[model samples]
Target: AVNGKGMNPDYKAYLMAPLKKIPEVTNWETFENDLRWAKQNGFYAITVDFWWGDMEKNGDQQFDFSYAQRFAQSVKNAGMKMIPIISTHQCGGNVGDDCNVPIPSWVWNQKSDDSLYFKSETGTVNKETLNPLASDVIRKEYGELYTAFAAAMKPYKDVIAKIYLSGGPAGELRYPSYTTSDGTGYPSRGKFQAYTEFAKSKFRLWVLNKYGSLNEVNKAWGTKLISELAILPPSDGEQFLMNGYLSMYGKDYLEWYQGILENHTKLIGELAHNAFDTTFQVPIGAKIAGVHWQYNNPTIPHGAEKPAGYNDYSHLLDAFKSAKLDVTFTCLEMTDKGSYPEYSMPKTLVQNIATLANEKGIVLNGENALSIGNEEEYKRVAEMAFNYNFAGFTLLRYQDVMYNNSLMGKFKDLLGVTPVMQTIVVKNVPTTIGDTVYITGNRAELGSWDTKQYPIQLYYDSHSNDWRGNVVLPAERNIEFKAFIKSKDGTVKSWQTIQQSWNPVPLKTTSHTSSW
Candidate 1:
């Protein structure tokens, strides 16, 4: 399945060259070295980070893609595909040292106050993260940063291959999810953000739109704020909504909070589509922090991020579809530590996320920053990628592949390195009701399309009036196969015509069906 602009659905591997995010850095040797090493390790593509603060650091709507323009060309020159991740929302501070690095000093200076950065519940200015509750910030500059981004790559669209338009803090779709040195909450607890007058105003409007009145809003959240403007969610939305908690109006509170994030994604997606329209079309995907509880550590706010609202992939994918983006990638850690054991959970995050994306016809890619603990751990992570039929797998940083030589070479043998052989089931084949059926296909899986080499019989279902058969065949490559109704009469199969068609199903999907 293709996204809004139709992305390549075949197996792909990308190496994250984190160096691209720093504008002051022009270490082409390092960047190109990462690409060369990645390609050497079977990575067909390389990811270059485009930092908003880095390019427009001088501020005042001034922009430059010289680094990006050169980087894309550089990667293409290396004979590699490009997945450019745009880091917007350099609106504020950081949780990690790398996190606090460089946001346009001009951004905060441009707005005078910290309106662009989300506010904490303590009524103090918050930086380090943009306000998810505000549209002006997300779609700032008429979204020229994003629009011009697509335009810059127009000359290299063929080489650009795909586009990744970033959103939220650090460019993975989610709220800050932690404190900003303000009186806000801890990331492990009820993380809160965007308490600005404008944020509250928008929340109030959402409340009205959701339930139609403050009376209804009060009824839902168990609060008494008199007017609609008082509907500020009490604190960070953490105290309410989740797998283990509930309130008389908890679902409603969850609805509104989640709705805000959903709306943010929808707006960003629309902004991206509009911006890309000024250029050419290529597959567009958004990276996400994965589902909650699955990460295992209850204290990690991002661990239970799914319940927290904004990071949920399902809601965002729906919004992406509405906004016209085509695919989503989940950042799953290679070391599943601090999270539930893969088998112990109901379903691994990769399986659940990919399954949902497939159902929605949205492209899905599974990614991990290396730490492939052991040889088995390496194979297991790669297995999930193939078993789920993902578009591909991505290593979080190329540096790991370059430095982690011991495990890096072995990774190529994992399923992530190639397309899986799929099991195709051709069901409900139309028969003469009482006739026998023979299934034949071009592959050895189906006797090379020869009826005599290895006759594969299809069993008849009297109740359904058809023959059904299933076979395991290689996926990601085209295969020719067909079924014929075997008639007992001398001139057999007169009722059905000779048939053979190609089945070129891609990964992340193993089954295809044909009808009488």
Candidate 2:
């Protein structure tokens, strides 16, 4: 019998490039070099954003794909595939945004309704993205956008490996429920986003359709109502603990609220499939926000997720299946650290979502929510990806991996490529009882001959009196290294006499006696 450890051959690693602003390739020499290096390092594709604000900035239904075309061509020239994300939402205010690309200004200038944008509880209107209640307009615009994109990108049809449909704020299928624009932060049950007239009307319509009549609604909700006018979004959803979230009425409202997001994704997926499915014949992907905090709440379980329309992801996965879309989730590098006060469950959520996606037969991919450092985090992410058989793993951006050699090595290790981790040990190190031993090598993972900045400390086993550390680097290649000692007072350094050079076999652990 086989288990999750069996790797999926189709699984590929991708690095998301930073937001491409005007003059797509700012420095061709540097950009080309980075792309070439990435392609050579076993990366399958580069995820690029085709910002609506940048591509179609001037007018409605008008596009200038020159910048995007040039960008995609450059990736092709470097011998790598491209995953173009149709970013319908704005850019700034999200993590990793070095530039501001607001939703095309014309979109606002020609709005059909004042309530086209989501409204917070404090009456703060979020124009960063359009509310799904304006489906009549959004459907048309999104359809045209996808169609135009397919037409313009048909030249590099083979190079287009996947197309990610951006359905809402920050290019994710989620509400702006916890946006900085609304002063919402972590751990708090974010304010609901159905205060707009359009949203309220849709909620009332959903309730009426469900119950068939105002009388039935009243009876089901255990409330006396004179009319459907009484039906409204939660006046104060923050009272989730004491309020009716667990009750039938609250359940109906929450389901409708989440349904809006699910429907929006389904709609975008359908449009994307219609345009790109036949043209490029690539997988269409959509991203979901990782609302891992406040999920284990006793009274209001998944409080943060509820407002973000991710209270339950099974229904969302069902939508993805229906639309023939793949799903990508973030926060793969986070651990359940310092989360006791808020009861955050990042790892548990990834497990739950991955399991659900498997059950639904939906292709699942993952990305890190924030910039990550260190090998332990990458190891954790790689373990999760393998354990879940994630179809793909994407890093946040290229700059981080391109400039940082250690991160690049770890990323390659995450993909099960170059620089594999191996256990290295040395015995009989000539040292005092309090002397500390260090492993220094000529590679970035081994400090690149820099002992202080990238110290690789080895644990001294009392029973065996051996120093050992797990090191990651290129396998089947000559690596020169040496063991050094530092006084317990950290005032002196001593180097080994013999310079050791060995060709480490892949996936093998080796031990050797130290030369004094």
Candidate 3:
């Protein structure tokens, strides 16, 4: 599952503004119906949204599985599977203004100093932030969240389920230690911070050990050592600004994120496989699809830096493979200006993705099919599904198909492989004697007949070209018979042969011919 569109039963239309206003409960019915429809129509799974705030409303200590339980139960009842998304931001309250909904307020409020949050472009506190490199607190909090989520979702383990962390670059919470009041600095938390702290402490100790006294240690190498350490040890922001961050820390970041993902995945898998009592089979497969490596949009406040409309998912593919995650899916937006079109994925990129998935032995799930404009583009995207051998594709909204027959027809044609008529017959002609008969019939194929080959031919002079028709002789001197028919194979079969009699019949003169 790529995003909430295929995962969460609620908020199916969360991406679209008009539909986003509908209450969650009301949308629940729609989601259930959509799931039922998908299953009935042969879709094996759907992506569903699972918010951290909703699942863990209070904190890591308190778990709320009511909504998720009901939703998953409905999906299972409908004979379908769910793919739940773990977001970095929560989509309500103060965070709603920036639409950076994922991080819970409990975590945000726990910040003691200014170092806890990342500054946005406006030099203000970003609502949804996570500092994986800060303190053990971040890792512990994620671990607890994973454990609780896993325990709560234990009942539906049999479904091909996965819990994805919101690793979107902007969604990643920056630690306070690295963060600075000015715009230029590094994260001060987690592994990065830990590494920094360890280096500093080791330097201090080394100086004391070498000098024998604290005063003597301060005099010799104190300033020199501090200056050397301050020379800059390579930062994420630096790598980002230089455009070569992926080259330097790509592997390291991939491994670190993979570890975090695996930690949660293993936690959930254990709970589902061992702890849960439901007869449902635990899904052994878990993954972190891929990180959304986005860039900032100056026009749109708190906008993600979406390169080519996608977050450089290619970088994480190798890491996911090493971690043995199911498959990595990428999420992107399509507007008039960005990389993807309104109705289709980037054609060239998707083609490459299809190739990549095949090479890697992974399944690629395409998201936002509806944004592709119409059936034509969807038809083009169908090629991607076939080319990529995708496990499945998630339409942004099921209702879009319900409202537009053209789109529905296209969707059905793509998903169901129904043959569509490409050409319309404009004229038909009947065979007649002495008429220089030009015979034609409807040449278009429909349904399963599309691939069948057939033939059309002209037959004349009471002589059939093939399949043996008896030749006939009329008492009159001037008479001819002609016919045209398409073969059973649907190809244009025709036969025309001239036959003649030696004796010419006498012409009967008419009074009307005197004028000539």
Candidate 4:
């Protein structure tokens, strides 16, 4: 292992991150439904987002294991691998995009010193963030949480392909660089962090470690602030051109800002490795939300050392690797729906990430975004994936391609796999209380109409109020399959005497309605 971390030796080329809330879909069955499509469409694994608050909202004594079990079962049921994206904070928003998940409300209530929060100058907490700045109690709890996660998932290690331990705010690796939500409505990123009573003391400690004594700190920062060198660089960072007392405050301020952010990412990584190493052995993943992915304007949000830049991940792979990050997923969306046109991410930045990730022995993954990615976009995404040999490609959501039959039809072919496999959902199968419905037809796949041979089974869907089931079949053929039910004790009920459609099943389709 390089730096106490490494990627899986048996890395697969296909991964699809269906990274939404824990249950994955509004109906609970939606994630399973989506996974069936992913599996049929050549996706080797499905990534899930683990919500920390919902599971342990009350306190540490309340980490519900059902969340883990249901997720593991879903992955195992699909005959696919699983990657649990373990998040410390909420999902996207209050800081870019819209996700209402947040840390347990009780966490902040317990600490009066604001130790668990990243405070702003106005004394407000970045509502979605949990300050990794809390050294002991925070890290101890982080370790305990994952150890419990390992136990909950240990029985299903065969399906637990990887664990994506989240870093920083919004479960992504980025500082809260945007302004806080307005008094009117909510906002993204957050007001500038690192302005807490606790942070001041920690910042002082960091300076002492980096520059030794107050004497050296004074010379480097051109500050003569006696014992408090950390105070020289203001908590609210100043632009490089916005100079003051030492003519070097701007330069020194940037260093402190960048250093603190890196330290945040580093601490999360190191702690996660420590947490996981003693408890479980599985590959790990991390995400770096590109500054282009951020939805702020009028402020510099692009480069590592730019005027108002917040994400400079290119120089932070060492931090991520220390946390044992195996694969790094970054947004390369041509247009991230809302932010596109005005906020397109450059491909060169992706190349920069690709270069560093390769040198570090970490696999790199890219995305086509959630808002857009038409045929041209998909083709370009494919081109980049092949060119960089990227480990995987995640289309940022579930809706866009779920019902778009034509695009889904072309997805598998682009993976260099066989033609697209459509999840042919045959609905309205007739069944009784103890009945089991099977799809048997005139083909070897369907057992060539043999009485006991079956290709797919239809189960009663309680939520949908109908017998629903699906089979992943190759496209461009007249699939002749008919439904039949067997009684509890093996007695054949009303048997199907025919296949409909006069040719009922259509090729290359996901939607179908059938009834007996």
Output the lDDT of residue 117, model 4: 64
Taking all chains together, the TM-score of candidate 3 against the true structure is 0.51
lDDT of 3 by residue, 85-199 (tens): 5554445432113232355677766656543444432333534445333345555666576667667776677763444444423222222222234332311111222123432
Candidate 4 matches the true fold with a TM-score of 0.67
Give the TM-score of each candidate: 0.70, 0.80, 0.51, 0.67
TM-score between model 2 and native: 0.80
What local distance difference test score does each model get?
0.58, 0.76, 0.39, 0.58
The per-residue C-alpha lDDT of model 2 at residue 370 equals 83
Worst 10 residues of 4 by lDDT: 1-10
* Local accuracy of candidate 2 as per-residue lDDT tens digits, 221-296: 8998887788888777767545678788888887888888888877877777788777888788888889888877
lDDT of 4 by residue, 1-516 (tens): 111111222324344444455444465577678778877776767666677886788786678878678778877876778777777777655423555666777767766676776655456566666666675666666777877777777778888766786766545665555543522122232344567778777766767778888888778866677556336335443332223413554545556656655666666567667667655676667677555433333342432223222434555776666656755555554533335324434565666677688788776776653444466666556545644546666665555556676777666555423223333334555666888766655533334454542335556778866665544433443447676777887656866555643243344456656656
Model 2: which ten-residue window has the lowest total lDDT?
Answer: 1-10
Task: Give the root-mean-square deviation of each candidate in angstroms.
Answer: 9.1, 10.0, 17.6, 17.7
